[PDB]
Every structure is written in C-alpha cells, then in structure tokens.
Amino acid sequence: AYKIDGNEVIFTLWAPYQKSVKLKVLEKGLYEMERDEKGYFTITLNNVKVRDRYKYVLDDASEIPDPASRYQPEGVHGPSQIIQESKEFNNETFLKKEDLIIYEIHVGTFTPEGTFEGVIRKLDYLKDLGITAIEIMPIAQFPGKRDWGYDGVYLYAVQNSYGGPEGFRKLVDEAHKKGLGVILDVVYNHVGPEGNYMVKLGPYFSQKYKTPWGLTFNFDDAESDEVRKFILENVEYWIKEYNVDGFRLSAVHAIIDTSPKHILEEIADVVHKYNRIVIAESDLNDPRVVNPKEKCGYNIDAQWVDDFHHSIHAYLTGERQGYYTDFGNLDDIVKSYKDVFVYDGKYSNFRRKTHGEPVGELDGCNFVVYIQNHDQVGNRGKGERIIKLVDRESYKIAAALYLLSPYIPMIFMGEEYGEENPFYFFSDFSDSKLIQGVREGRKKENGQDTDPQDESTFNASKLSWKIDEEIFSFYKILIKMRKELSIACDRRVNVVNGENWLIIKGREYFSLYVFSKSSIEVKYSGTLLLSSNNSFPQHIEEGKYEFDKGFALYK
Numbered sequence: 302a303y304k305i306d307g308n309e310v311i312f313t314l315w316a317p318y319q320k321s322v323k324l325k326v327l328e329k330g331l332y333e334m335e336r337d338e339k340g341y342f343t344i345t346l347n348n349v350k351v352r353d354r355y356k357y358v359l360d361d362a363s364e365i366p367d368p369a370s371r372y373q374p375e376g377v378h379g380p381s382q383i384i385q386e387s388k389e390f391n392n393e394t395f396l397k398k399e400d401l402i403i404y405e406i407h408v409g410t411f412t413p414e415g416t417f418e419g420v421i422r423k424l425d426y427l428k429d430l431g432i433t434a435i436e437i438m439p440i441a442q443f444p445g446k447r448d449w450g451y452d453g454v455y456l457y458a459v460q461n462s463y464g465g466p467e468g469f470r471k472l473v474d475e476a477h478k479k480g481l482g483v484i485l486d487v488v489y490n491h492v493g494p495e496g497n498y499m500v501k502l503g504p505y506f507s508q509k510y511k512t513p514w515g516l517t518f519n520f521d522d523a524e525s526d527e528v529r530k531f532i533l534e535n536v537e538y539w540i541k542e543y544n545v546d547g548f549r550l551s552a553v554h555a556i557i558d559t560s561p562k563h564i565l566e567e568i569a570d571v572v573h574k575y576n577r578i579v580i581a582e583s584d585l586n587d588p589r590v591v592n593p594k595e596k597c598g599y600n601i602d603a604q605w606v607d608d609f610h611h612s613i614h615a616y617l618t619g620e621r622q623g624y625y626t627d628f629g630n631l632d633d634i635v636k637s638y639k640d641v642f643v644y645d646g647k648y649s650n651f652r653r654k655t656h657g658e659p660v661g662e663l664d665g666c667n668f669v670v671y672i673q674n675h676d677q678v679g680n681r682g683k684g685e686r687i688i689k690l691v692d693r694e695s696y697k698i699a700a701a702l703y704l705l706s707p708y709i710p711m712i713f714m715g716e717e718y719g720e721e722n723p724f725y726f727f728s729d730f731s732d733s734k735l736i737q738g739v740r741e742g743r744k745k746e747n748g749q750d751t752d753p754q755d756e757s758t759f760n761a762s763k764l765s766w767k768i769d770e771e772i773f774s775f776y777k778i779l780i781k782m783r784k785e786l787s788i789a790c791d792r793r794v795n796v797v798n799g800e801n802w803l804i805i806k807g808r809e810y811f812s813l814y815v816f817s818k819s820s821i822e823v824k825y826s827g828t829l830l831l832s833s834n835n836s837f838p839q840h841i842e843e844g845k846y847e848f849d850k851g852f853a854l855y856k
Contacts (some may be wrong), residue, residue, distance in 0.1 A: 453493055456492075495730050627643070665706070707807075782830050
C-alpha cells in the first residue's frame with residue numbers, strides 16, 4: 302500500500318496483469334511507477350502528507366482505489382486516503398481464554414448513532430453486564446452504509462460511515478480503559494461483489510475453486526505468494542495499527558489451501574506471534590482447525606460449534622427446516638453437552654454424507670456456543686430472534702444451557718435484555734444487477750419478504766434498548782455464577798435426562814432444566830443460586846420431586 306519513512310513515503314502496488322501503472326495523487330500529480338518482474342510497481346515520494354487522497358491509473362487509463370487502502374473516505378469507488386500511522390500496540394492481550402464471554406455487535410444497528418461512538422457509549426453497560434470481550438462484525442469498507450459486513454471489499458480500510466480509523470481506534474482504546482477486549486470479525490474467504498478492483502491487477506482469486514460465496518482467494522496456485530502475503534499482513538495490520546485483541550475468522554471452510562502449510566496455520570502463527578486470540582467459524586466439524594500442531598492441527602484458539610445452537614433451537618422450537626432437520630431431540634443437546642459435536646462422523650440427511658470427526662480430549666475453551674447470533678437470526682426470512690419462537694421459561698432455559706456450558710459463550714446484542722426486534726439481512730449496493738440479485742436471492746433462499754435494499758429493513762433491525770428487567774437480571778446473574786462456580790472450560794460434567802427434563806452436574810454445581818412439568822429424581826444436595834421462577838426450594842436434597850417448567854441452579 303504505502304509506508305511513511307521520515308518525511309518521505311513509499312507506494313507499493315501488486316499488479317502483475319498490468320504493463321504500466323501511474324500513481325495519481327489527487328491535485329498533485331500523475332507519477333510513473335517503477336515495475337519489478339514479480340509484478341510489483343513502486344515509487345518513493347517526498348511531497349505527501351496525511352489527509353492526502355490518491356488513486357492508481359491502469360494500462361487502459363481507468364482509475365481505481367488502492368486495494369490495500371487504509372481508508373476510503375468517499376466509499377468503495379472513491380479515492381484512498383493517507384492516514385495517521387500511529388503504530389502503538391501492547392505486545393500482549395489482557396484477555397485470558399478461560400474468562401472469555403463474548404458479545405457480538407453490529408455497529409450500524411447496535412445503537413441509534415450507528416457508529417463506534419455509539420459503542421463507546423455502551424461500554425459501561427457491557428462491563429457491568431459481565432462480558433469480557435466484544436466481537437465486532439466486519440468493518441472492512443463495504444458498499445454504502447447498510448450491510449452486515451460480509452460484502453466488505455477493502456480489508457485494510459475501516460468503514461467510513463462507522464467512524465473510520467479514528468472511530469475504531471478510539472473504540473479499542475476506550476474498551477481497554479474499561480477492561481474489555483475487542484475481537485474483530487475478518488473475512489479472508491472471499492471479497493464482496495461491488496467496488497472490488499483486484500481482478501484487474503493480478504490472480505487474487507483461485508480459478509480452481511468454488512465456495513458457497515463464489516470465487517475464493519488464491520493461496521496455492523501461480524503468483525499466490527503475494528496473495529498469502531496480503532492476507533497475512535492484514536492480520537498483522539489490525540494488531541499493530543489498531544491494537545485489537547483477536548479475530549473471528551469468517552467461514553474457514555471456504556478458505557481452500559493445498560500447500561505444505563495451510564494458510565490457516567499461518568494466520569494462527571501470526572496471531573500467536575503477537576500473543577493474540579483467534580476464533581474460527583467452521584462448518585467442518587473437524588478438530589484439526591483447533592488442534593495443536595503436534596496433533597496435525599492449525600492450532601486456532603477456538604471454533605464456533607453451531608451443533609450446540611442447533612440442538613437447542615430445534616428442540617425448543619420444534620423447527621426442522623434447513624439444517625434443523627438434522628436435529629430435534631433432547632438426545633442432541635446432551636450429545637452436544639458431552640461430545641461437543643452432534644455430527645462427529647455420523648450420516649447427515651441434510652448434507653447427504655457422513656459429517657464430522659470426534660474432538661477427543663480438547664477442553665471447553667476450544668469451542669464457542671451461543672443461542673443467537675447474526676446468522677441464526679439474520680438468515681431467517683423474517684429475522685425473528687429466538688425470543689419470538691419459544692415461551693419465557695424456554696428462553697431462560699436456553700440462556701442457561703449455554704451460559705453454564707463448559708464452552709466459551711457468545712451473547713448476541715440485545716439477547717440479554719430480551720430484545721424483540723428482528724435482525725433482518727440488509728445491504729446497500731448501488732449496481733442495479735447486484736441490487737436485483739440480492740432481492741431475488743434473499744427471497745428465494747430465505748423467504749425474506751422485507752426488501753434488504755430498503756432502509757426501513759435496517760431501521761427495523763436496530764436494537765430497541767427496551768430493557769426487560771427480569772431477563773436482564775437473569776443473564777447478569779448467570780454470568781456471575783459461571784465465574785464463581787469455575788464452570789469455564791471444564792467438560793467433566795455428568796448429564797442425566799428423562800423425557801422432558803435434564804440435570805447437568807459439574808464440579809461445583811448442578812442444574813435443573815425442566816422443559817415440561819415432570820417428576821424428577823435428584824441425586825444431589827445444594828443451595829439455590831438462581832432460578833427462572835420462584836417454585837424452586839432454597840435448599841434441596843436427594844429425593845424425588847415434581848417440578849413445573851423452569852430452570853434452577855444449585856450449590
């Protein structure tokens with residue numbers, strides 16, 4: 302991209318497809334760029350400063366922003382701009398994996414402001430809630446102002462309308478001051494479809510592979526060294542330039558690499574070199590994502606386990622459309638509590654193949670579980686939070702199953718005070734072919750009836766901030782109890798279950814999940830810490846009991 306060096310500055314653009322590229326500093330010049338054989342164009346410049354805008358003009362004299370742009374002040378079609386280069390970073394994250402409770406935020410909708418500034422304003426509320434890290438949905442510059450972020454198209458540019466680079470940096474500084482970590486959701490498996498100029502430059506994209514997202518990055522074919530470098534330098538950049546604590550990697554099953562060292566192992570290497578954390582979204586149900594190198598693994602810190610969410614959702618909602626078909630039984634939930642994956646090398650009707658592998662002896666903290674998140678709400682055509690699909694008792698029973706699980710729990714913005722608003726899928730393209738593809742895609746795939754390119758759709762998705770105090774108090778206590786009971790990471794749990802109930806016992810507690818009024822046989826003594834209603838005794842002893850629907854936590 303660029304590197305500020307004393308009072309001069311070096312511009313480097315990878316562009317093997319190109320014979321001839323000129324740097325165009327808006328209102329200062331065209332300047333010819335020097336070309337090496339590997340395809341790099343360079344030039345040093347003396348007359349450049351922060352706030353300066355630029356482009357690159359190609360063989361065909363068309364003009365494009367720096368794919369490695371640090372900031373796109375006027376969008377995905379506007380010029381790149383030089384930014385401040387404050388490269389200050391702690392060598393360590395203060396986050397400890399065993400203490401991680403994650404809160405997923407979508408900046409645009411978190412807050413009436415719609416910006417990082419708005420998130421700084423909620424820091425106190427979060428700290429007080431007991432969250433220990435916030436996960437920020439992708440902020441790589443995407444088209445327009447309304448997008449979940451997966452259509453990001455400038456990996457190094459903080460989205461203009463969220464507050465850009467200053468906003469984000471201020472977010473992480475303030476987060477740290479309050480003692481919260483920030484985790485950044487990054488997308489290395491694909492690039493969005495408007496405002497991407499990389500095809501014009503070089504083989505950024507594999508000709509070898511299709512993913513659910515179409516074209517993937519080229520990590521293993523001709524000229525791929527440079528493209529490995531682009532991604533690997535992006536993880537470095539978020540760490541040195543913004544002091545981020547860690548990453549969530551989007552859809553690692555769509556990152557293909559047949560090299561002797563998988564790019565995923567290399568990504569994890571960068572993050573660990575700088576003592577950070579990485580978490581993977583994986584559809585593979587394969588421990589190699591998360592195993593040590595000595596175990597043939599990429600050594601990623603943890604992975605999402607959709608199986609735990611699916612088990613819960615399918616069982617409590619009675620839904621079986623989509624991936625839900627592979628779930629539904631109370632057995633699925635105990636399986637996920639015990640073995641992490643429901644699909645650990647068993648046939649899937651949904652997928653029409655055997656799926657998964659056991660996970661062996663890894664502890665709870667290699668995995669992340671949740672009852673809601675941006676996909677599990679957002680990919681429903683009507684975007685209904687789960688709070689609309691089960692009764693109050695169930696919703697509490699759900700919140701407890703995951704917050705008291707041995708795995709790292711992730712709260713979805715609003716879940717904790719009982720938000721009822723939908724979280725719709727929205728976008729903000731301006732290419733009419735794209736606009737029409739998305740509305741038709743979305744309707745046909747998801748049954749989305751709201752128009753995603755319509756602003757009302759994004760308005761409807763903004764948190765209400767309408768606190769339900771009974772739910773909020775319940776979450777807050779759950780989180781406190783998890784810490785005190787030393788529940789994190791510990792998979793030495795005993796689980797009994799009857800038809801309509803479950804008891805889960807750990808080292809220091811036991812929980813009653815009663816789905817439906819039942820006569821349960823309780824093998825434990827203990828004193829009540831929290832409960833979903835008032836029907837549970839303050840002190841309980843080994844015996845048979847008739848309970849009503851609800852949850853209680855003992856000892």
